[PDB]
Symmetry: C2
Subunit: 60 residues, 2 copies
């Protein structure tokens, strides 16, 4: 019943994360949010690259 489960459109979390930083926008050296935001993306992109060659068609 309780709201949860990942893959929540993926954009939902991203949007909420942004709205949060909007308020936490370097309010007091929030570099921590940067390392997190960055680490997520580094791992995110890294996984993207990890894939056997076949076509790699550009997203429409």
């Amino acid at each position: 019943g309780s709201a949860a489960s990942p893959a929540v459109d993926i954009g939902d979390r991203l949007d909420e994360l942004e709205k949060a930083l909007e308020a936490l926008s370097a309010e007091d050296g929030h570099d921590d949010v940067g390392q997190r935001l960055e680490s997520l993306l580094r791992r995110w992109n890294s996984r993207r690259a990890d894939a056997p060659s076949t076509s790699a068609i550009s997203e429409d």
Copy 2:
């Protein structure tokens, strides 16, 4: 009563984001995720830089 409010420890958003992503791990060219992921930071890191010189002491 309903759970909300930003800056929820911030990494709380992020954490869930990665977990989400872990699901969307290049599941179907979720390049949109990284676009958001990046946008977040480029907006995040940028604001960080936006600050008058005074000391800029490195985080412990």
